[PDB]
Paper text:
Here, we identify ZUFSP as a Ub-specific DUB that selectively cleaves K63-linked polyUb. Human ZUFSP is a modular protein comprising 578 amino acids (aa) with four C2H2 type zinc fingers at the N terminus followed by a conserved motif interacting with Ub (MIU) juxtaposed to the catalytic domain (residues 294–578) at the C terminus. Our analyses reveal that ZUFSP is a novel DUB with no homology to any known DUBs, leading us to classify ZUFSP as the seventh DUB family. In summary, the UBDs in ZUFSP we have here identified, the ZHA and UBZ, form the distal and the putative proximal Ub binding sites, respectively, to together enable the DUB to selectively cleave K63-linked polyUb.
ZUFSPMIU-Cat was complexed with Ub-Prg and crystals of the complex were obtained at 14 mg/mL. The asymmetric unit contains one molecule of the complex, with clear discernible electron density for residues 236 to 578 of ZUFSP, and the entire Ub molecule. The catalytic domain of ZUFSP consists of three subdomains: a compact central subdomain that is flanked by two helical extensions perpendicular to each other. The second extension created by α1 forms a long helical arm, ZUFSP helical arm (ZHA) that protrudes away from the central domain. The crystal structure reveals that the catalytic triad in ZUFSP is made up of C360, H491, and D512. A conserved Gln Q487 forms the oxyanion hole that stabilizes the carbonyl oxygen atom of the scissile bond. Strikingly, the conserved ZHA that extends out from the catalytic domain cradles the distal Ub by making extensive hydrophobic contacts with the Ile44 patch of Ub. The main hydrophobic interactions are mediated by F260, L263, and Y267, which are all positioned on the same face of the ZHA, and these residues are conserved in evolution. Extensive hydrogen bonding and ionic interactions between R72 and R74 of Ub and D406, Q408, Q412, and E428 stabilize the C terminus of Ub. Intriguingly, only part of the MIU is ordered, and this does not mediate any interactions with Ub.
Author numbering:
A (entry chain A): 236 to 578
B (entry chain C): 1 to 75
Write the structure that this text describes.
Amino acid sequence: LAHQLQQEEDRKRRSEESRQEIEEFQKLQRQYGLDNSGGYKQQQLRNMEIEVNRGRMPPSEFHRRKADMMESLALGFDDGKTKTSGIIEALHRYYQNAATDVRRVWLSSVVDHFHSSLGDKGWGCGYRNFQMLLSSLLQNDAYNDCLKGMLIPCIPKIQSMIEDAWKEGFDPQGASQLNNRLQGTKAWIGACEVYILLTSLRVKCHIVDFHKSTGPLGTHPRLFEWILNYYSSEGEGSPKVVCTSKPPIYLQHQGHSRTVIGIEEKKNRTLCLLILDPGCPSREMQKLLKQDIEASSLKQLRKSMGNLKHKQYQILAVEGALSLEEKLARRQASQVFTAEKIP
Amino acid sequence: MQIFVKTLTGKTITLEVEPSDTIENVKAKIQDKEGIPPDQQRLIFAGKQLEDGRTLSDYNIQKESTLHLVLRLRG
Ligand SMILES: [N+]
Ligand SMILES: [N+]
């Protein structure tokens, strides 16, 4: 009797615990894109079917878009429908010609913005950031040999390319964290995946891990100072606006990533990062294209230390090209995967 | 008491813990069995990411509870 009383309560507790665990696991696997419920192709189609069902899109047009999607996916090429070009050149014009609170501003080289489409909304950030970074490398002659013949890949192709890096032997522990597969999924990725992808293409790059806050009020001054150092040059005759040859910086925090395309040193000596978000729709990006930039729009691009209070950031920065021997050295190093840590 | 720690690929381990264990201590115990540094771990239970300086006590973790383990920094 006594034993039965204990056994029954335990059973009931266990069952409730199990139900809770199962429900949570499901929610998390789904959020992280690891529940094996399908990929980009599926989401695009499902979301376009909503657009038909809601009466917002003709059924014929669904067939045309689907056709075009399938061609792009077969080729492995992004279709460009979420791309906005000319932001660097527009910022250069603005900073040169407009009365600002800026002493000096450093910009990365030409960079195309990519936002998520219907296919990757909610999960494509890391991939879209990779596309922005790559757009800059593809216009930079330093990377012509390593990246020869490449166009911006579509998200499914990026997933394939990561898998290829895993197959070569990069970062097996990272592969195992994502079930060794990315195609046909909505998997969140991080700087570690972007790293092995670029390394596998013979691009020299590295991660820096800002693993805890370094300033008052949970700020990350070290991060701002690292980016200033990356963008800036020692001195001499540097102009107020410097459009550098440097690629932009991939910026990860838990849950989301963005692309840093420059940094402003205000007249009061504080620093402000210029950040593109792959969540920003084309109509918002277009505002930066008009000759006089709204105050809200500029404010949206500008991030001060108060705006970066996540516990941990990682950056990935690109530094040049690798020899095959240097790539193989990095492939072996990636077996015990580490990054520079600050502090 | 025993608890379980499960990654989002379904890999599961058991840990021996006390209610007074900090989340920091639990991440150490995971490192002890899997070699994963604590800075790479995020633990979630009942919808909440668990904070380092709090105890299992603080979160009503019971024997045979499962914590979910998110690895590295992704988004
Ligand atoms: N979209
Ligand atoms: N995104």
